[PDB]
């Protein structure tokens, strides 16, 4: 009858009771992890983002399996050995398997990365809290190059942690991310424009200096802020974000007259079919590199359009480039097919 | 299956002498990375054999590994599973750190299964990764000439070249390696010179 | 042609527009691509997929639970799933899934009664499939006996 | 204790023995109704046992001590 009092009882039982989630296929032990369950109305399981990596779980319709550890022994096996908080590092390599991906990386990249002047270049801030106050007030961009006073906490020769205070030349964004950073980590780790590769080293460092509790809380914080700023950013994919280099058709007509030269040298019966095959493939392979390099110089540094005195050069904030550069999604290889030349395809034979 | 941590210390002196890995050109596996969290078998000190640098049964921690780089250690005997004397399993010492825990392995842990899962998984998953997605064919094997970046003395090993008519050192050996000695003298870069290659110097 | 059609609509060439967060009211930092994508609801409704079981019917010879939501089935805990518990060292969880959760007929009922009595005690025995294995091997004319302690 | 078990593992050491010790104690509170040392703060027996081990009140050896203490006093009473 699903009586009202029964739900209150169910709520009582599931507290502090771990449940096992499993994804097929179970390739390594992290394919099963324990969580504390949170009851939700609605028929789908909700999974924590950061362990998506261990399960290889993407929500394009994936399903997972639930198991209840019954005995006191089984409950403690789940909470102590199999809990997600307890199992971070890959047993295969000494590496943290729990790492921000996708939106999270994009958000942190967006916040840390700097821009020419923009709103409120060269200001001076009392704390990262004044910085947050300034950004959300609308008197500073996250990419404004402004000097802030942060107090970093460095571990000494003994257990005692040393605190030091100095003026850092970071941006508003980096100041706000410092708020997520635990005391004990240096400020210099967040002071660079952050990508996926730098964030994993962030977590590793955190783990070896502070230990487990701090890393777990820190990881969660990073996820929250990462999403939050990814959404603020308004990042999108328009067809104008795919930039073709102006010099495609020239490179191609040139490469096409070149291939014609070797076809003519074949028809003369001097160059063998195999030599021409190899030299046509070499001509196109070089054409492909050149077109890709042309696209990437034209895209990477296309913000040749700045300010303050007169014209200056900077990194492009083109959406697809940000996505690839941050390591959130895509790579230069993908962008080649999108905006550049697709390139030489391979037959089912393996032959090109 | 059966292999489990049975003992704490087998009391063996045995172990494999590991060396830094330099495949291609970029340091793929550093000695520290290869040896981290491994028990150091036999008092392994510094070049000058006249003072013990490191002890016996001592788990290689990150601090210890950092010291190895300052001292520039060539190669180190490390306790291995293969050289364990424990019958019907292996000792925590010969294995070393549970990589998943970040400290020395607990006795009772079923290591063999972990090992097989660890070796097997990447293969099984990579069979799915570059294949649902595997599309564009981007091969790269135009290795025509080796260019040295750091100045140094040319050091060839297991090589038997012969001077030609042109005046160049033509190698007549299959497996030919080319090292890059620095000022003091230590291998920094390493390449693979094939048979019938022309050496400039 | 599409940009020309957008201009007839007085919409931007970029097809990106200024959007405002419903919660805060402030604008998002940059233009977002907005438009009409024709979308489909696939036959995979969650109503058809969600399934759950504590205790139910059991299979005929092996005595382990049946499979499938249509038969009110238990999830298969397969060899690969077993190995994971072996790596972990989680021994009681594993034993539980082999015995009181599956075949062990004495074990399951006794365990159920213990759960209703709060005491989460493990009271295991031998899975009924192993008993069968033995009988199958002796039917082959191979003597397989248990030597006790 | 609830979220992270690392400090509790650092008291006993062997994760495997931590589980056996906390299970045997949790069984005592579950069945014997043995009284908790730490304020429950509305937590289940399993969590109480882990808190007790974290603070260093429960131990394999200490459990075995109180087992013989109580069993021997009952033998004394019978004779």
């Amino acid at each position: 009858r699903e009586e009202a009092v029964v739900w209150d009882i169910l709520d009582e039982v599931i507290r502090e009771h771990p449940v096992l989630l499993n994804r097929a296929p179970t390739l390594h032990r992290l394919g099963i992890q324990a969580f504390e369950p949170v009851l939700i109305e609605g028929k789908a399981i909700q999974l924590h983002p950061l362990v998506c990596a261990a399960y290889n779980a993407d929500f394009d319709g994936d399903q997972m399996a639930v198991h209840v550890p019954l005995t006191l022994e089984a409950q403690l096996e789940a909470r102590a050995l199999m809990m997600s908080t307890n199992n971070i590092l890959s047993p295969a390599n000494g590496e943290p398997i729990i790492v921000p991906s996708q939106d999270v990386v994009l958000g942190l990249y967006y916040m840390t990365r700097d821009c020419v002047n923009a709103k409120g270049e060269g200001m001076v801030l009392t704390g990262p809290k004044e910085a947050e106050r300034l950004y959300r007030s609308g008197l500073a961009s996250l990419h404004a190059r402004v000097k802030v006073r942060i107090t970093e906490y460095e571990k000494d020769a003994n257990g005692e942690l040393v605190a030091k205070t100095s003026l850092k030349d970071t941006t508003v964004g980096r100041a706000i991310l410092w708020m997520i950073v635990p005391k004990g980590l240096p400020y210099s780790i967040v002071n660079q424009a952050l990508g996926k590769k730098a964030i994993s080293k962030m977590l590793n460092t955190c783990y070896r200096i502070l230990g487990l509790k701090p890393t777990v809380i820190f990881a969660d914080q990073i996820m929250y802020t990462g999403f939050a700023y990814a959404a603020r950013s308004g990042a999108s994919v328009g067809i104008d974000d795919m930039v073709i280099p102006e010099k495609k058709h020239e490179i191609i007509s040139e490469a096409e007259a070149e291939v014609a030269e070797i076809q003519e040298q074949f028809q003369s019966g001097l160059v063998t079919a195999g030599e021409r095959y190899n030299k046509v493939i070499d001509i196109w392979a070089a054409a492909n590199d050149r077109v890709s390099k042309a696209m990437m110089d034209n895209l990477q540094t296309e913000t040749v359009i700045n300010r303050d005195g007169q014209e200056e050069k900077q990194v492009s904030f083109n959406s697809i480039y940000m996505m690839a550069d941050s390591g959130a999604r895509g790579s230069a290889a993908q962008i080649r097919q999108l905006a550049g030349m697709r390139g030489l395809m391979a037959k089912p034979d393996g032959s090109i | 299956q059966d292999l489990v941590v049975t003992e704490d210390d087998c009391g063996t002196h045995e172990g494999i002498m590991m060396t830094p890995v330099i495949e291609g050109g970029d340091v793929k596996e550093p000695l520290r990375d290869r040896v981290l969290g491994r028990v150091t078998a036999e008092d392994v000190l510094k070049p000058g054999t006249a003072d013990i640098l490191v002890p016996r049964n001592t788990l290689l921690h990150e601090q210890w590994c950092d010291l190895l780089e300052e001292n520039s250690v060539d190669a180190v005997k490390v306790r291995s599973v293969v050289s364990c004397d424990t019958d019907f399993g292996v000792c925590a010492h010969c294995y070393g750190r549970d990589l998943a825990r970040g400290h020395i392995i607990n006795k009772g842990e079923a290591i063999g299964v972990i090992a097989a899962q660890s070796i097997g998984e990447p293969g099984t998953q990579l069979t799915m990764r570059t294949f649902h997605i595997g599309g564009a064919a981007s091969r790269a094997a135009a290795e025509s000439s080796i260019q040295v970046k750091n100045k140094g003395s040319i050091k060839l090993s297991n090589v038997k070249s012969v001077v030609n008519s042109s005046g160049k050192l033509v190698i007549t050996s299959r497996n030919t390696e080319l090292k890059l000695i620095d000022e003091f003298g230590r291998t920094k870069e390493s390449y693979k010179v094939p048979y019938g290659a022309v050496l400039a110097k | 042609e599409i940009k020309e059609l957008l201009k007839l609509g007085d919409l931007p060439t970029s097809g990106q527009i200024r959007l405002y967060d419903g919660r805060t009211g402030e604008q998002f930092e940059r233009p977002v691509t907005v438009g009409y994508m024709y979308m489909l609801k696939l036959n995979h409704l969650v109503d058809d997929k969600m399934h759950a079981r504590s205790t139910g019917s059991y299979s005929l010879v092996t005595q382990q639970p049946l499979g499938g939501k249509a038969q009110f089935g238990g999830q298969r805990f397969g060899e690969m799933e077993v190995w994971a518990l072996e790596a972990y060292g989680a021994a009681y969880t594993l034993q539980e899934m082999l015995t009181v959760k599956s075949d062990d007929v004495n074990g399951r009922t006794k365990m159920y009664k213990n759960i209703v009595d709060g005491n989460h005690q493990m009271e295991p025995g031998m899975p009924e499939s192993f008993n069968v294995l033995l009988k199958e091997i002796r039917s082959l004319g191979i003597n397989i006996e248990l030597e006790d302690e | 204790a609830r979220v992270t078990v690392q400090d509790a593992v650092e008291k006993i050491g062997n994760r495997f023995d931590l589980v056996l010790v906390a299970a045997r104690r949790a069984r005592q509170m579950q069945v014997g109704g043995k009284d908790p040392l730490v304020p429950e703060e509305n937590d289940k027996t399993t969590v109480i046992a882990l808190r007790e081990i974290e603070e260093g009140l429960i131990n394999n050896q200490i459990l075995d001590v109180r087992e013989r203490q109580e069993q021997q006093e009952q033998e004394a009473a019978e004779l």
């Binding site: 050995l81 | 489990v4 006795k107 009772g108 | 060292g89 | -």
Partner: peptide, 19 residues
């Protein structure tokens, strides 16, 4: 005979060793 079970399994092995 591993992980959680190593405690119980060695306690059986000593019961086996002593009769």
């Amino acid at each position: 005979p591993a992980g959680t079970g190593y405690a119980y399994h060695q306690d059986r092995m000593r019961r086996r060793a002593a009769g």
